[PDB]
Design a protein around this ligand. Structure first.
Ligand SMILES: *[C@@H]1O[C@H](CO)[C@@H](O)[C@H](O)[C@H]1NC(C)=O
Lengths: 650, 124, 961
C-alpha cells in the first residue's frame, strides 16, 4: 500500500504566494511530481506550475510556491469562482475543484482623531499590506461618505513604501454632523476593502462640567437594593459649583448601539448640589418591578440608562450629562473553555479546562467549579456520570477536569457550573457544552495535546507536543506527519519516526517567527488497510506571543511624565532593521470612555487574524472535518470521501 | 499548601536498582499532576518521569524510558520510582514535584511546577 | 407634565411633535395665536402648536417655579431626538509625519502650548511586516498658572475692571502674588503686590481696574510670582475709538497709453477731514497698487488666504458659504484659461495643485444646505428655496469645469427646480417666504417685476449647469422660461429686471429678433460720463421714472452694470465695454469685493472674462507715490515678475499724488479711508429704529426695526435683512434666548450668531406697517464705569446702502478735557493772565459767547460768537462768525451755561478742508483757559474783577509779552 497526501490552503488567493505541500509514502528511490493550477473551464490553460523532486534525501516531501497572477485572469467584471488544483507524476494523477477569493490585502485606515469639530482638518493615512504581511506598493482609492450616504470626495494616491499618506480632509465651516464613513479599496486587481468611522459633532460652549460617578460599572445582587451615585459639577479647571438643583431620570436600555430606551417614570428629584458634590441612592427593585419586568433574571445583559440635568441656582444656567448604560449582571462570573476541542476520541481521557472571568473580563481565582455530564452510546443508552469538582487555579484562572469515558461513547453532553460560597443558586454562572466522537471506519483514532497550555510559546524556544493514538494496527504505523499553519498559509511540514515500543511519543517543534501571531498544528498518521489506507488526524490551536519582526520602541528624553508647555524635547525611535515609521501625537482626552468603539491602533491584532481560515480549538468529526477546521483541503488515494460543496470555511 | 518529602536515595553501583519514594503532606494526591525531576550540580533541572491524572497517563524522558518505572499507591499516598540499569549520567539530586490540577499529561517543564520537595541524592 | 405627554402621544406619525414642543416653550411677550401666525409648515403643525401652547399656559398659574422647571426638563427629554454635539474641544493633532529609520533615528521639536495629556503612537512598516509600538504618554501640564479674561475691544475713557483667575493644582494650599506692568498710555488710577492665598486644589479670583487713555494695541504684561517659579504673561488690550467706523473708497485706473480710453497718468487723492470726526484720532488710509484689472483678487487671496471677500457681511446664510468659494474659482479660471501659471517664482504645478484643493474644500461647504431631494435651503434645516437652488446650480456649474461635480446630484437638483415651481406660462415661483430683493412699483407691478427677476435668475443658473445634465425636460423648461422672458421684458418697469433678463437670454439663442430689441432698450438706458465716454454705468431705476442721477454707487448700481457687461461680453461688443470696465475697476475695493453679494459675483465674472477676452499686455510701468507738500512716500517698478506687491499704510496727513511715467499695461490703484465719526444725521436712514434696556424680575434688550419704503417702493416690506447689535463693553448676551428664537417652528429670526461682541440676527423680511422686535436677556460679565454707548445697525443684505445706524447704551476720571476757572475774581492776577497767554503752546486767546448746546456721542458741540479778538496765531477767526468747540461730556470741572460769555484761550486749533471752504474747529483740553465773564453787573467783587480783566485785555492786544 502506497499513499500520497497533497496539502493546500482551503481557498486560493489571487496574487498570493500559496505554498503547496506534497508528502508521499510507500515510494522508493527517486521520482518527480508536477504541481499545477489550471482553469476550471479548461485544464489547457496554466495559471502557474512548479517542479518538485521527491527522494530519500528529501524524505519524499517537498514544497512548491504557486501564484495565480492577476494579469492572467480576464478583466471583465464577472469574477472567476473556481480553479483546478492538479498533481501529475509518473505514478498518479489527481485533481480538485478550488474556490478563489479576490480578498488578498489588508487596509487599515488611520485617522488622527475619532471625533472632530467644524473647520478642523482630518489627517488620514492608510497602511496597506499584502497577504504575506509585506509593504506591497499598490495604488489605493479613498472615498469619503457623509452621514446621509453621499460620496462627497474621492482621492487616489500611489503607494511607495507601504504607508500611503493622503491629503487632509477639510471639514466645512457648517458641515453635516454625525457619523462619517471612509472606504478604502484597490484601483485595479483585488476586492479587498478597509473601513473606518469618525463622528463630526458641533461644538457648544459649556457653562460648567457635569460628572456622574456610579458605585460600580455593573450591578450585581449586592447592589440590587441600593446603588450609590455621586454627581459632581465644577466650573472650568479647579473651580467648583457652589449651589445647584439636580434632577435625575432613569431608563432601561437594550443595547448601547440602539438609541431606543424604556423610561421609568418613578425618578428621583430635587436633590442639592452642595460645594460641588451631590449624592443619591437608586433602589433598583422598586423602580423596575412596578414599571417593568418582575424578576432580575429578565434583566440580565440589559443596561440602565441614566440622565442628569443640573441647573445652577444663582445664574440660572443649565447643563446636561448622561450615562449611556450600566449593564445589569445576573452572575459575577462568566465561563468559557480554553484549549479544549469539542471532539471525543474513544479510549482516550477527555480533558476539560474551564476558565472564570468577572464582568471586567479578568481571571478570577479560587473559584470552585462543579462539572456534571451525560453520556450517549451507539445504542442510544444514556448513562449519568459521577460529578467531579475542581477549584480554579489563581495563576491562570483555570479549573481543570479529566473524564474517563467508555470506549463506545459517541456524544458527551456536559454542563459546568460555579459553586461560590457567597453566591445564591440563581446568581451562579452556568454553561453547557457538547462533544461528538471522531468517526473512523477502522476504529482508529488520534489525539494530540499540548501540555504547555499556559506559556506564551516564546519564539526561539521549542514545542514539545505529545502525540497519543489509541487504535488497533498501532504497531504497523511507520511515522507521524505534521503540517504547521499560520495566517492561512502552510509554513512548515515534516515527519517524525514513530517508536514501535512506546504508546505515546514526544514530538519536538522549534517555534519560528512565521508562527508569532497564531498557529495551527495538524498531525496525522496513515493506517494501512487491505482494502484502502485510512488517514487518522487531529489538530490543535497554538496561541503564540505577539512579537514584532522589527520591534519599534519610541522614547522621550526627558523621561518624566509631567512636561511643561513649549518644552524642547527629543524623540528617539529604534528598530531592529531599516523600517518606515508613521508617527502620531493625539490628545488622549479624545478617547476617554468608548461606547461601541475600538481603538484603531489595537484594532490590528484582531483584524489580522481573519486570514486564519481555521476556527475553534481544533479537532473534527472525521478526517476530512479535521482538515477542514484547520483551513485545509487535501487530495489522497487513501480516502475517497471528501467534503462536498464546502465553498467557504467557517 | 503541600509539603513534599523524598526518600530512598542512596549510593548504587552502575547497573544497580534503587527505589525512590515521594510522600505528600497535606494533600491526598487525588487526580492531581505530580512528577519526578533531577538536577545535576551546576546544571539546569530536567524532567525524568511523570504520571498525569491518577493512573491513566504516563510519560518518561527518552533518557530513562524503558529503564525507569513510575508507580503510585493511591491508598498509601506515595509515589514510587523504580530505577534500573543506572549509569553515571543518572547521578543527580532527585526532586519530587507536583502541580495543582487534573491534568492528563505530564509537563516536562520545571516552570509548570509549584510545590517542591527538599530532594534526595542519587550517586551512581 | 403627563398632561402634555398625552398630547404628544395623541397625534401620530411624528413631524408635529416639535410643533407641540416649541409651542409649550415660555414666551411671556406673545400670545399663542401670534406665535402660530408665523408657522409655514401647514395646518397639521398649527393645530398641535395651538393645543400644547394653551395647556402649558394654564398649568403655569397655580404652580410654583420649581414645578415649572420639572415640567420643562421632562419635555426637553424623550420628545426631541438626539443631537450630535460636544462640550469639549480637541486641538489639532501633530507629529503626523513619516520617517525612514536606519534602525535608530532621533528627531527634535517643541511641545505645543496646552494643558493636554498627549499620546504618541508609532507604527513601523518594513519587509518583515507591521509593528505597533508601545504607546508612550506625555502629559503637558502646569500646576500653577494665571489666566486673564481680556475683552475683544475697549472704548477709550472707560474704566474697565479686568478679571482673572489663578489655578492651583498642588495638593497643598499656597501664597501667591500677581502684579501688573504699567505701560505709559494706560492710567490705572494708582501709577505704582498685595498677597492673597489660594486653598489647595482650587482657585482664586483676580481683579484689576484700568482706564486706557490712548488708542491702539498696548503690550501689557502680567507677572505671576509664586515660590515654584515666576511667570510673565504677555497680553494686548485693543483700544478702539468712539463712534462708528466708516470706510470710504476712491478708485483710479492707470492706462498710460490710452488704449481702452483716455490717457490716465496722474490722479490726486485729496486729504479731507470728515465733519463729525472723533477728537484725537488719526485718519487711516491704506494704499493698494495691483497689477491687473483682476489683480486685487489675485494678490489678496494668494497672500492672506482671503476666504471671504465680504468680511463686513455676516456668515449664516448658505449664500455666504457659496461666496467663500467665489474668489478662488475666478482666480483659478484666469490662470488656467490664459495659461499664466508662470507668475509664481516657485513650481507652478504645486500652486495649481494647492488652488485646486482650496476650490474643493470651499465647494463642500454647501452640502449641508442640501435636502434629501437634492434641493437647497438658504438656512440649514429650513424650507427649500427656488432662488438659492438656482444660485447653487450656477456656482456648481461653473466650478464643474475645473473640479468635476457629482453628475447624479446636479441632475436631481435641476429637476427639482423645473418640476415643482414652474408655472404654466413658463415663469418661476418661490417656495419659501424668502424675499431676496425689494423692487419698485405698486402691488400688482411689484408682483410682475419679482416674477420676472426669479425667472431670469433661474434661467442663468440652469444655463451655467445645463451641459452637465443635458436633459430634454430642463431644456423644455428652458424654452418655456425663455419665451416668458422674451415677451414680458419689453414693457419694462426697471433697468434692474431688464438687465437680468438680457443676460439670461444672452445665455441661449442670441439670434432671436425680440432679444436684440431688449438689448437695444437696455443700451438706451446707459449713463455716460464724458464725450468720448470715459465711464459707462447703469442706474437700477428706469430713467423715465426717476431722472436724477446718483453721485455714488450702491449694490444695485454695481449689479445692474455687471449684468449689462456680461450681456455685452457674450455678444463680443468690445467697443462698448471699455468705459464700463473703467467704471467697475475704480468702483472696486482693496478687499477685492464690492458692496453686497450679488453685485460682487457678477462684477468679478465681468472683469475676469474681459481680461481673458482681450490680450493682456506685459506690465512695465514706473509707479511713484508721493505727497504734494511732504516728502516722497515710495515708488515701485511694476513688472510681470512682481505685481502682487505688499500694501502700504499712508501715515502722513497730506494730500496724496499718484503718478507714473511712460508705461505699458493697466494697473489699478485703490485707497480705502477709515475714519471714525460722532454722528449719523448726515447718513441716509432707511429704517425707523428704537432700542431700550429693561429690567425683568435680569436685564433684557428690546431692539425693534421697521422698513421705510421710498416714494416708488411698495408697502410689502423689506427683503432679506440683517440686524447687527453691538454690545457695550462688559455686557454679555444670553445665548439661550437667542437660540430659542430661531430653533423653533414659530421662529422670529432665521439665523443668529455672536461674533466679536456683536449679536447678528438675520431675517426674511422686515415689515413696513409695524415694528418687529428681538428680545433677549443680558448679563454683566464685569463692572464698567462711564460706559460708552454701543451701536445698533440694521440694513438690507443685498443692498447695504439702505441702512440706518443708531446709538444706545445700557484718579484719571477727567481725561485731558479741562478745568473751568472759579467764577468771579480770585488771586490769579492780570500779569499771570498774560504769561499764560504769551505761552508758545497757546495759539489763540479771545472772548466768546455761547449760542447753542448740542450733545452728540459723548461730545458736546458749542456754536459760539467771536466777540473781541486778543490773539490769532495760524488759523483765522473772523469777527461775528460761528465757531465750534468740543469737550468730553463726562467731566465735572468743565461745565458751560447757555447764554453766558466766557474768555477762552487754547493750545490746539484744527483746520478742516472740504476742498471748498476752510472751516475751523478748536479743541478743549487741560491747557485751555476758560473764565466766567458777567455782562456789566456791578456786584461787590465784580467791579474789581472787571478791573483786572480789562487790565489783561489791554496789554494782550498791545503786543506785550
Ligand atoms: C513686558 O512688556 C514689555 C513692554 O510691554 C516688553 O518689553 C516685554 O515683551 C515684556 N516682558 C517680557 C519678559 O516678555
Amino acid at each position: 500500500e502506497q499513499t500520497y497526501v497533497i496539502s493546500a490552503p482551503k481557498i486560493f488567493r489571487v496574487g498570493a504566494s500559496e505554498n503547496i505541500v506534497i508528502q508521499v509514502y510507500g515510494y522508493t528511490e527517486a521520482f518527480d511530481a508536477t504541481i499545477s493550477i489550471k482553469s476550471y473551464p479548461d485544464k489547457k490553460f496554466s495559471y502557474s506550475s512548479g517542479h518538485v523532486h521527491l527522494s530519500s534525501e528529501n524524505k519524499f516531501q517537498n514544497s512548491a510556491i504557486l501564484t495565480i497572477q492577476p494579469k492572467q485572469l480576464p478583466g471583465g467584471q464577472n469574477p472567476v469562482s473556481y480553479v483546478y488544483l492538479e498533481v501529475v507524476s509518473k505514478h498518479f494523477s489527481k485533481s480538485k475543484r478550488m474556490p478563489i477569493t479576490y480578498d488578498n490585502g489588508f487596509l487599515f485606515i488611520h485617522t488622527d482623531k475619532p471625533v472632530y469639530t467644524p473647520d478642523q482638518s482630518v489627517k488620514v493615512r492608510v497602511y496597506s499590506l499584502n497577504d504575506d504581511l509585506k509593504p506591497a506598493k499598490r495604488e489605493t482609492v479613498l472615498t469619503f461618505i457623509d452621514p446621509e450616504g453621499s460620496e462627497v470626495d474621492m482621492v487616489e494616491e500611489i503607494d511607495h513604501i507601504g504607508i500611503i499618506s493622503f491629503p487632509d480632509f477639510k471639514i466645512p465651516s457648517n458641515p453635516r454632523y454625525g457619523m462619517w464613513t471612509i472606504k478604502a479599496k484597490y484601483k485595479e486587481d483585488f476586492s479587498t476593502t478597509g473601513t473606518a468611522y469618525f463622528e463630526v459633532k458641533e461644538y457648544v460652549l459649556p457653562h460648567f462640567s457635569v460628572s456622574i460617578e456610579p458605585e460600580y460599572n455593573f450591578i450585581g445582587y449586592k447592589n440590587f437594593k441600593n446603588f450609590e451615585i455621586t454627581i459632581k459639577a465644577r466650573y472650568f479647571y479647579n473651580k467648583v459649583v457652589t449651589e445647584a438643583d439636580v434632577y435625575i431620570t432613569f431608563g432601561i436600555r437594550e443595547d448601547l448601539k440602539d438609541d431606543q430606551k424604556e423610561m421609568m417614570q418613578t425618578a428621583m428629584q430635587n436633590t442639592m448640589l452642595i460645594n460641588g458634590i451631590a449624592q443619591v441612592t437608586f433602589d433598583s427593585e422598586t423602580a423596575v418591578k412596578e414599571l417593568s419586568y418582575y424578576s432580575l433574571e429578565d434583566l440580565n445583559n440589559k443596561y440602565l440608562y441614566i440622565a442628569v440635568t443640573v441647573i445652577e441656582s444663582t445664574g440660572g444656567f443649565s447643563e446636561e450629562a448622561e450615562i449611556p448604560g450600566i449593564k445589569y449582571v445576573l452572575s459575577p462570573y462568566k465561563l468559557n473553555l480554553v484549549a479544549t476541542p469539542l471532539f471525543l476520541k474513544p479510549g482516550i481521557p477527555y480533558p476539560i479546562k474551564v476558565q472564570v472571568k468577572d464582568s471586567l473580563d479578568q481571571l478570577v481565582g479560587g473559584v470552585p467549579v462543579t462539572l456534571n455530564a451525560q453520556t450517549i452510546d451507539v445504542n442510544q443508552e444514556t448513562s449519568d456520570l459521577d460529578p467531579s469538582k475542581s477549584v480554579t487555579r489563581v495563576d491562570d484562572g483555570v479549573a481543570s477536569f479529566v473524564l474517563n469515558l467508555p470506549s463506545g461513547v459517541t456524544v458527551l453532553e456536559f454542563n459546568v457550573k460555579t459553586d461560590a460560597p457567597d453566591l445564591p443558586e440563581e446568581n451562579q454562572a452556568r454553561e453547557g457544552y457538547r462533544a461528538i466522537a471522531y468517526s473512523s471506519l477502522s476504529q482508529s483514532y488520534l489525539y494530540i495535546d499540548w501540555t504547555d497550555n499556559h506559556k506564551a510559546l516564546l519564539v526561539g524556544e521549542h514545542l514539545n507536543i505529545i502525540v497519543t493514538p489509541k487504535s488497533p494496527y498501532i504497531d504497523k504505523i511507520t511515522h507521524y506527519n505534521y503540517l504547521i499553519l499560520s495566517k492561512g498559509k502552510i509554513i512548515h511540514f515534516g515527519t517524525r519516526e514513530k517508536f514501535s515500543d512506546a504508546s505515546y511519543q514526544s514530538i519536538n517543534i522549534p517555534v519560528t517567527q512565521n508562527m508569532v501571531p497564531s498557529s495551527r498544528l495538524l498531525v496525522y498518521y496513515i493506517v494501512t488497510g487491505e482494502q484502502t489506507a485510512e488517514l487518522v488526524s487531529d489538530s490543535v490551536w497554538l496561541n503564540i506571543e505577539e512579537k514584532c519582526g522589527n520591534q519599534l520602541q519610541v522614547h522621550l528624553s526627558p523621561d518624566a511624565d509631567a512636561y511643561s508647555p513649549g518644552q524642547t524635547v527629543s524623540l528617539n525611535m529604534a528598530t531592529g532593521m531599516d523600517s518606515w515609521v508613521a508617527l502620531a501625537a493625539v490628545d488622549s482626552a479624545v478617547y476617554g470612555v468608548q461606547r461601541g468603539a475600538k481603538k484603531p491602533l489595537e484594532r490590528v491584532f484582531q483584524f489580522l487574524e481573519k486570514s486564519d481560515l481555521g476556527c475553534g480549538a481544533g479537532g473534527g468529526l472525521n478526517n476530512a472535518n479535521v482538515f477542514h477546521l484547520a483551513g485545509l483541503t487535501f487530495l489522497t488515494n487513501a480516502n475517497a470521501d471528501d467534503s462536498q460543496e464546502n465553498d467557504e470555511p467557517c | 499548601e503541600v509539603q513534599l518529602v523524598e526518600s530512598g536515595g542512596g549510593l548504587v553501583q552502575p547497573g544497580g536498582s534503587l527505589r525512590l519514594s515521594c510522600a505528600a503532606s497535606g494533600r491526598a494526591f487525588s487526580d492531581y499532576a505530580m512528577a519526578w525531576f533531577r538536577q545535576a550540580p551546576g546544571q539546569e533541572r530536567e524532567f525524568v518521569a511523570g504520571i498525569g491524572w491518577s493512573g491513566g497517563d504516563t510519560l518518561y524522558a527518552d533518557s530513562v524510558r524503558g529503564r525507569f518505572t513510575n508507580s503510585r499507591d493511591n491508598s498509601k499516598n506515595t509515589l514510587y520510582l523504580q530505577m534500573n540499569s543506572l549509569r553515571a549520567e543518572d547521578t543527580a539530586v532527585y526532586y519530587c514535584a507536583a502541580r495543582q490540577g487534573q491534568y492528563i499529561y505530564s509537563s516536562m517543564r520545571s516552570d509548570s511546577y509549584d510545590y517542591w520537595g527538599q530532594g534526595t541524592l542519587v550517586t551512581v | 407634565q403627563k398632561k402634555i405627554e398625552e398630547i404628544a402621544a395623541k397625534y401620530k406619525h411624528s413631524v408635529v411633535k416639535k410643533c407641540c414642543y416649541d409651542g409649550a416653550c415660555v414666551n411671556n411677550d406673545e400670545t399663542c395665536e401670534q406665535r402660530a401666525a408665523r408657522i409655514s409648515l401647514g395646518p397639521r403643525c398649527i393645530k398641535a402648536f395651538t393645543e400644547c401652547c394653551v395647556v402649558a399656559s394654564q398649568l403655569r398659574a397655580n404652580i410654583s417655579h420649581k414645578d415649572m422647571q420639572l415640567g420643562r426638563l421632562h419635555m426637553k427629554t424623550l420628545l426631541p431626538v438626539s443631537k450630535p454635539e460636544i462640550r469639549s474641544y480637541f486641538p489639532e493633532s501633530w507629529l503626523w509625519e513619516v520617517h525612514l529609520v536606519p534602525r535608530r533615528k532621533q528627531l527634535q521639536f517643541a511641545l505645543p502650548d496646552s494643558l493636554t495629556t498627549w499620546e504618541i503612537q508609532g507604527v513601523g512598516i518594513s519587509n518583515t511586516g507591521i509593528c505597533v509600538a508601545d504607546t508612550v504618554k506625555a502629559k503637558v501640564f502646569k500646576d500653577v498658572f494665571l489666566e486673564m479674561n481680556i475683552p475683544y475691544s475697549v472704548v477709550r475713557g472707560e474704566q474697565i475692571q479686568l478679571k482673572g483667575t489663578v489655578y492651583n493644582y498642588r495638593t497643598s494650599g499656597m501664597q501667591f502674588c500677581v502684579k501688573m506692568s504699567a505701560v505709559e498710555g494706560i492710567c490705572t488710577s494708582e501709577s505704582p503686590c498685595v498677597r492673597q492665598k489660594v486653598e489647595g486644589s482650587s482657585s482664586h479670583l483676580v481683579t484689576f481696574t484700568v482706564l486706557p487713555l490712548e488708542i491702539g494695541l498696548h503690550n501689557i504684561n502680567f507677572s505671576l510670582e509664586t515660590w515654584f517659579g515666576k511667570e510673565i504673561l504677555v497680553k494686548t488690550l485693543r483700544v478702539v475709538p468712539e463712534g462708528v467706523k466708516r470706510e470710504s473708497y476712491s478708485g483710479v485706473t492707470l492706462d498710460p497709453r490710452g488704449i481702452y480710453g483716455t490717457i490716465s497718468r496722474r490722479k490726486e487723492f485729496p486729504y479731507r477731514i470728515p465733519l463729525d470726526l472723533v477728537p484725537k484720532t488719526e485718519i487711516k488710509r491704506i494704499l493698494s497698487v495691483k497689477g491687473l484689472l483682476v489683480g486685487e483678487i489675485l494678490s489678496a487671496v494668494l497672500s492672506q488666504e482671503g476666504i471671504n471677500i465680504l468680511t463686513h457681511l455676516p456668515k449664516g446664510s448658505a449664500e455666504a458659504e457659496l461666496m467663500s468659494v467665489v474668489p478662488v474659482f475666478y482666480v483659478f479660471h484666469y490662470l488656467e484659461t490664459g495659461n499664466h501659471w508662470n507668475i509664481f517664482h516657485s513650481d507652478p504645478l504645486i500652486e495649481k495643485q494647492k488652488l485646486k484643493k482650496k476650490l474643493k474644500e470651499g465647494m463642500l461647504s454647501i452640502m449641508s444646505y442640501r435636502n434629501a431631494d437634492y434641493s437647497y435651503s438658504v438656512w440649514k434645516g429650513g424650507s427649500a428655496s427656488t432662488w438659492l437652488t438656482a444660485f447653487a446650480l450656477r456656482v456648481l456649474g461653473q466650478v464643474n469645469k475645473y473640479v468635476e461635480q457629482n453628475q447624479n446630484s446636479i441632475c436631481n437638483s435641476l429637476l427639482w427646480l423645473v418640476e415643482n415651481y414652474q408655472l404654466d406660462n413658463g415663469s418661476f415661483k418661490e417656495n419659501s417666504q424668502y424675499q431676496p430683493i425689494k423692487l419698485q412699483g405698486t402691488l400688482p407691478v411689484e408682483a410682475r417685476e419679482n416674477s420676472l427677476y426669479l425667472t431670469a435668475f433661474t434661467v442663468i443658473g440652469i444655463r451655467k449647469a445645463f451641459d452637465i445634465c443635458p436633459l430634454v425636460k430642463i431644456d423644455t423648461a428652458l424654452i418655456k422660461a425663455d419665451n416668458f422672458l422674451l415677451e414680458n421684458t419689453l414693457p419694462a418697469q426697471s433697468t434692474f429686471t431688464l438687465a437680468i433678463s438680457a443676460y439670461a437670454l444672452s445665455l441661449g439663442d442670441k439670434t432671436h429678433p425680440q432679444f436684440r430689441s431688449i438689448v437695444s432698450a437696455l443700451k438706451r438706458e446707459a449713463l455716460v460720463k464724458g464725450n468720448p465716454p470715459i465711464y459707462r454705468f447703469w442706474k437700477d431705476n428706469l430713467q423715465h421714472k426717476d431722472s436724477s442721477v446718483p453721485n455714488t454707487g450702491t449694490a444695485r448700481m454695481v449689479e445692474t452694470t455687471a449684468y449689462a457687461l456680461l450681456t455685452s461680453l457674450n455678444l463680443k461688443d468690445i467697443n462698448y465695454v471699455n468705459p464700463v470696465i473703467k467704471w467697475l475697476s475704480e468702483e472696486q475695493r482693496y478687499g477685492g469685493g464690492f458692496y453686497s453679494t450679488q453685485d460682487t459675483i457678477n462684477a468679478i465674472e465681468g472683469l475676469t472674462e474681459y481680461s481673458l477676452l482681450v490680450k493682456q499686455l506685459r506690465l512695465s510701468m514706473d509707479i511713484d507715490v508721493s505727497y504734494k507738500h511732504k516728502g516722497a512716500l515710495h515708488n515701485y517698478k511694476m513688472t510681470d515678475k512682481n505685481f502682487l506687491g505688499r500694501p502700504v499704510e499712508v501715515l502722513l496727513n497730506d494730500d496724496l499724488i499718484v503718478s507714473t511715467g511712460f508705461g505699458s499695461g493697466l494697473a489699478t490703484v485703490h485707497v480705502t479711508t477709515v475714519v471714525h465719526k460722532t454722528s449719523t444725521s448726515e447718513e441716509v436712514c432707511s429704517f425707523y429704529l428704537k432700542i431700550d434696556t429693561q429690567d425683568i424680575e435680569y436685564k433684557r434688550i428690546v431692539a425693534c426695526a421697521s422698513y421705510k419704503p421710498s416714494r416708488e417702493e411698495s408697502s410689502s416690506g423689506s427683503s432679506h435683512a440683517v440686524m447687527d447689535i453691538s454690545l457695550p463693553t462688559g455686557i454679555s448676551a444670553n445665548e439661550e434666548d437667542l437660540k430659542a428664537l430661531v430653533e423653533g417652528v414659530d421662529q422670529l429670526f432665521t439665523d443668529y450668531q455672536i461674533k466679536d461682541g456683536h449679536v447678528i440676527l438675520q431675517l426674511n423680511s422686515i415689515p413696513s406697517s409695524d415694528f418687529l422686535c428681538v428680545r433677549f436677556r443680558i448679563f454683566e460679565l464685569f463692572e464698567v464705569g462711564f460706559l460708552s454707548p454701543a451701536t445698533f445697525t440694521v440694513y438690507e443684505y443685498h443692498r447695504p446702502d439702505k441702512q440706518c445706524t443708531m446709538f444706545y447704551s445700557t484718579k484719571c476720571v477727567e481725561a485731558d478735557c479741562g478745568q473751568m476757572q472759579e467764577e468771579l475774581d480770585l488771586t490769579i492776577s492780570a500779569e499771570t493772565r498774560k504769561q499764560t497767554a504769551c505761552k508758545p503752546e497757546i495759539a489763540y486767546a479771545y472772548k466768546v459767547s455761547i449760542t447753542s448746546i448740542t450733545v452728540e456721542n459723548v461730545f458736546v458741540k458749542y456754536k459760539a460768537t467771536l466777540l473781541d479778538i486778543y490773539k490769532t496765531g495760524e488759523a483765522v477767526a473772523e469777527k461775528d462768525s460761528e465757531i465750534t468747540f468740543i469737550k468730553k461730556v463726562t467731566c465735572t470741572n468743565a461745565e458751560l451755561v447757555k447764554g453766558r460769555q466766557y474768555l477762552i484761550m487754547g493750545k490746539e486749533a484744527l483746520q478742516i478742508k472740504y476742498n471748498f471752504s476752510f472751516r475751523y474747529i478748536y479743541p478743549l483740553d487741560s491747557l485751555t483757559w476758560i473764565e466766567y465773564w458777567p455782562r456789566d453787573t456791578t456786584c461787590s467783587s465784580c467791579q474789581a474783577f472787571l478791573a483786572n480783566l480789562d487790565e489783561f485785555a489791554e496789554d494782550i492786544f498791545l503786543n506785550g509779552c
